[PDB]
Design a binder for these strands. Sequence first.
DNA 1: AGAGAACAACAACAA
DNA 2: TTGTTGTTGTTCTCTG
DNA 3: AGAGAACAACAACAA
DNA 4: TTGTTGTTGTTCTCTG
DNA 5: AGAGAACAACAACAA
DNA 6: TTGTTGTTGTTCTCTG
DNA 7: AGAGAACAACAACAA
DNA 8: TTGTTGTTGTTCTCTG
Lengths: 502, 502, 505
Amino acid sequence: RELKTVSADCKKEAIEKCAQWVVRDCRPFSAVSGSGFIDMIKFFIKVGAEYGEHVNVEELLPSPITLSRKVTSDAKEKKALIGREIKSAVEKDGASATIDLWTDNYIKRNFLGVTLHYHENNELRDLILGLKSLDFERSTAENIYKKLKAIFSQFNVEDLSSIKFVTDRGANVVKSLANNIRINCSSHLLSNVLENSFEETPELNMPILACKNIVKYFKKANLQHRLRSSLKSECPTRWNSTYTMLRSILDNWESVIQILSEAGETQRIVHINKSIIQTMVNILDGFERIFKELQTCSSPSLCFVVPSILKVKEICSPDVGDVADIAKLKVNIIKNVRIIWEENLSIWHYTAFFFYPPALHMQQEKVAQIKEFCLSKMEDLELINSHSKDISTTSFFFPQLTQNNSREPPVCPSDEFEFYRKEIVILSEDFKVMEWWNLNSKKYPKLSKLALSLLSIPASSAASERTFSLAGNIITEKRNRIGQQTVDSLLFLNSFYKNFCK
Amino acid sequence: RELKTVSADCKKEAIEKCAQWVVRDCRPFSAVSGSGFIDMIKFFIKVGAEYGEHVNVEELLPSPITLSRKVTSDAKEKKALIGREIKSAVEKDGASATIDLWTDNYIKRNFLGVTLHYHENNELRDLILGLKSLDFERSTAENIYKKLKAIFSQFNVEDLSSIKFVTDRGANVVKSLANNIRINCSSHLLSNVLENSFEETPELNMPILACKNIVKYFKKANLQHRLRSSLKSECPTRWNSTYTMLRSILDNWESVIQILSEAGETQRIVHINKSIIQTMVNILDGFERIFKELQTCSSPSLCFVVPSILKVKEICSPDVGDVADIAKLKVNIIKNVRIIWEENLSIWHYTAFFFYPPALHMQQEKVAQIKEFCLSKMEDLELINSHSKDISTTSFFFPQLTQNNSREPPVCPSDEFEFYRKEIVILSEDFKVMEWWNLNSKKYPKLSKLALSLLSIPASSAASERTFSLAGNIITEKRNRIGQQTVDSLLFLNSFYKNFCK
Amino acid sequence: HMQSRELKTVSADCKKEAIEKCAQWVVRDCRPFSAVSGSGFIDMIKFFIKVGAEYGEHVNVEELLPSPITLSRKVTSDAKEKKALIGREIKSAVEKDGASATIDLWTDNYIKRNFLGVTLHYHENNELRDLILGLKSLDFERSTAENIYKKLKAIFSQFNVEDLSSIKFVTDRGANVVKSLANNIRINCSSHLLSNVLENSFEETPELNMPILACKNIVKYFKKANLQHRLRSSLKSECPTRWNSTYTMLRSILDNWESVIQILSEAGETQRIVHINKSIIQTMVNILDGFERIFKELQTCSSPSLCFVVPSILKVKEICSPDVGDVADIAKLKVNIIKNVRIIWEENLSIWHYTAFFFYPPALHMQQEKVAQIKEFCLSKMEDLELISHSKDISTTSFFFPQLTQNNSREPPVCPSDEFEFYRKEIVILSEDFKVMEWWNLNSKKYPKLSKLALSLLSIPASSAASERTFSLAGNIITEKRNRIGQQTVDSLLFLNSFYKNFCK
DNA sequence: AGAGAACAACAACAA
DNA sequence: TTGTTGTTGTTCTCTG
DNA sequence: AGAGAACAACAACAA
DNA sequence: TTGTTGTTGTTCTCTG
DNA sequence: AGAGAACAACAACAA
DNA sequence: TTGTTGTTGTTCTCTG
DNA sequence: AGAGAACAACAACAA
DNA sequence: TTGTTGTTGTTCTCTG
Ligand code: NA
Ligand code: NA
Ligand code: NA
């Protein structure tokens, strides 16, 4: 168990041999740091010791095609393996899922990505169930539901109703999930607020285009190279696109007013009211933070939506110096937050905020329906159908306090609920909604099940996107022949190893 | 940092050399396992490496008299050193202390032991301030207070009033602390209940004496040696003296009815109603658990007194088969619990129970005075006279919830109190009163100070006793010349190293 | 790795840390300051320096340092090993008719086990061996002669000694023990005898009862009245079990007399001492002071002692010489001490005793009927050990001196009688440093067959002291805390320690 | 309790 | 397999 | 004796 | 001079 | 967010 | 001191 | 060419 | 026979 440190003369040969790998094989330096590579390097030492330095490597080392093959099989195995856990989760109501469509760019195969999210032990699960080619089949509602239904079969989940689905507003997909629980991606929602808000504030158009072109120039004119940080362009498809850009100009201002002057093109930047830029950036900076909190799956997020909404509305509160132009923007963002975001929220959203100990907030009418919803929801999950030395010091002094049985029927729904409402949790820096319910699991038997249930619903389809992101790094320019089956396998295996092994 | 494992040939010589130490020096085998010996063995390796295997040991190794001298000085140093912490503690009201008188048995010097107890960080402090010879000075109230006052000066604590003293009922001592906060040792109290209860239940006398003599015989007749476990005698000065004995007979019954029969003295055991014994043992077993919980200083205890009282009263509840004799006993224990224990409790006691989350219990009149006490107590302690990425996710979404300032004046005493009362903590196996207040420190600013303040008051003078116990292992038959100054030093140093170093 | 006599000194900066680290040990672990002066500790510290140099400071001490149980285990092992090892040297000495032993029963105070201590003494080179062979339990067997013998027989097998007859056993007068040795060589403990004499004596002199008790109560008082703390030395009490009990107590009062008359007066209790005849006190401790010395001479095991028995007896009788101003009381005391010395001590010595005095160079003394018997004995003992053309043809002597008929005798040595007789003709001047042992070792040449017999007697201890001492030792192993240590471990811990003292430098 | 101590009958391991 | 070590958990001890 | 222990009051030093 | 060490010699403890 | 990758300017260390 | 390593924290990239 | 990649459908094996 | 491996040869990718 005492890990042996080797000779510096060996360590020296180690370096050389690895570098050469990276060179001869065109691998990234980070290749050696990969955790999975370490473990394999370990097994090759565990062979060298138990077989001696004269092995027939070439025979020992599997051929690519077997690796691909082990993967595809290994896939079916583990998919099958957790078939139960997932199956339980789904049925006991703690399942949440996100789906989106994506397309590679070599064969242009059209895919459906599906992610599952649930609460186990003290952790929140971030699972990729699969990336299935919709084949070359139109890409209609029906066909989506089908492949959706299909991806779940692999785990042996056949009743999809108890699943809370988080998806963007893609006409096709929303219709596919027309008969199930479907929550609107608040990320996509926010971005819609952002896009419409700007569009209806043409007053801002100029300095944006102005800025747009300060980049366009720098790129074209090949002087980006001296900024320390590049001027980031647009790429409108991305979230908080404007922000990232203005911020790039702002972050570099000095260095740029200067190079445009001495290279005599101050014509470019002089019409740009820097204050307006500075200001839009502040407004927008918060959106960036909200944009990020809503894309997290390693912690609950749905609870943060209503507060994100409160944050926008605060940011957009009219302050005193408010330049005429900014102020119009603010009123617009606000107006859109209501007619676009708020309007597309659901009961889930509100409840989830409610499940965040500092509860005082939605007193208004919301508490009412919230309860009623909670009740309806908890009833459904009620269809789960030597002496005195070695005895707990608690049990010893307060025996009437521990009592009898595994089940605790007396404390009812309405009582647990109204019990919650009495709570008073002080907000602490580190506080974690997830822990706090797992603590009060005891005091809140059936309610805590509901809470961790909502608290696991992702706040947006980020999850799905991220998948496609990933699939991308495997369906590469050179790796282009990789097959659907193979891909889904690779993706799944990688998700699994993360969610299921330490 | 990679600890080198040595040659088995060295490890072999290690053994030999150590054994010889134990033999040649008449040391206990456990001598090598002592943590303090390890650390010194480490420093002798750190010398061997940095000076080589040819050192003049004999000169290097200090003479006893310097060791004694370093100790006595080292003493004054650290005593001085924590002078502040203790001083604070005392003043900010979180100080608790226990004192008792004791006498060695070589010079027959008469001592005063003093222990301090307080709450720091997440820990509870078990401190020996000192063992001072009262000299050969009568041992009157005055002289005690004096040496008491004196022991505190060493730390520079001159105002003793804010100190909550836990002591037995020794006429002299109780008078010495006549003007301070003095709480009655509940251990001593319990034992008084036990002793008087038995005495007033002469019906039990016979089988006890019977039993007493079954030991007396076995000891005298030298057949104890074959029991597996000895028959434990009386030693009345000890707590739960009867119990430990009956239990010894009971635990061995078979093996003894048998040896008394085959060695023809069944006359001895035949008059002993075994059931009565069995029963007294059960009654008494709980007392044993209560006896132990009340002697703990590494966790709060005062909170367990009232519940210990509830436990006795439960144990003594009349059950059905109750033999006439047992039943009288039960009624007596009960009667004494009131006129001896309950009667000698104080407000502290009740409050401390109250400071144990499952609070429902003392609803009756007690809550009233408890509050009033708590208030009075808290008023006294009121005489202590890149942007938006690197900002707490809590602070970001709920800023009105974190607010402004270090101090929180709005939430007042009565509000904090009535705030507590609303709490509902479910009792869990592992639950710890100390943690729970340190958690709610936030929500309960001034109250939590009060709570951890009481929660640190030892429930009995156990602490002091234990000290004398210790002092004993230093003022040994051979070590008899050891001096007062030296002793107190040794004791203190050892307390310190425990409370102040990991 | 065998040299370099110049030893390095350390920086007073490291001397400053060893100081710290050692105190901490003593504090943290609760050991006495004297722990570090220990010889064994030192030899061990050395070995840990030798480890750090040969391995570097970053060693895994925990792994290294053996567990306590591993140590106990070794000790029981090492015991068994060395006990077997010396098995020869001992087997020898016993057979070479020059080994003696002690025996006594002792009982511990935790488990209250009942033990049998056995000490062996003999002479090898210019030294006397004082050795503990064992402390075995009688288990819980009655404690009869049969068992004592059996266990005694048994402790000896451990060294492969199966024949005990040739051993000289000195034992007290325990009803039990004397019977177990009924068929062997048993010499009575002179120390126990002396205490016997002392006790009967005082008892048969009630006259002193009063002043003694009187004194006893002055201590009793000083203790109960917490006054002890003010004299230079504490008043001492009786503890009747102890030897020369009364003396140690009287002496304490005497040495502190002033200090106490003063105290008692200023506390209106002068009623306490006023009846104590200081003169008698004085006198008694003077008589008694001698007994102390005799007592202590009788408990030595490093120098011969059996020879000093007779001289001690002579000394007591000399101290009880009626002198002139002798107070009737004291006088009566003396007469009684003498009476008992004759009927208790002298009455229980045996030939071994006499002979052993005789082997002390200044040999003049028991010229008495004693010498006739002594030779007779020495002859028998030296036998046991033997079981391991005219001008030319006529002696140069028978020609030069014919009228010297004498022939049978043989002056320069030859046989036992001659060696004995040539001993007699000696004249050794008793100088201050004279070591009877050294002298016989030198004249081993001069006296071949006699020096053996002599050194053989001279190694027999004068009393049971060694055995008592053993128990005292056993006492420090079977501590309140260290209670639970089993026979095995104890016998080992004890033996090894003795072995290491007697067989190493 | 909370301190020091030994050991029987374990269970972990190196050879 | 077989010994050697170090683990466990029980049994003492002491202050009342 | 022959074992273990601490310490007041030394006497020796290094600084 | 001054403080720090180690030295001596006395006072305890135990077996009886 | 949550994934892979390189590196400048560090700070830790062995010689 | 002087090099060699491995650390940090910033800068890219991608999915929307 | 001259580089990286995955894979359907082979052909070779060990069992 | 039967499954598991490694083989071939074709289909992609990129510089232009
Ligand atoms: Na291969
Ligand atoms: Na030294
Ligand atoms: Na070890």
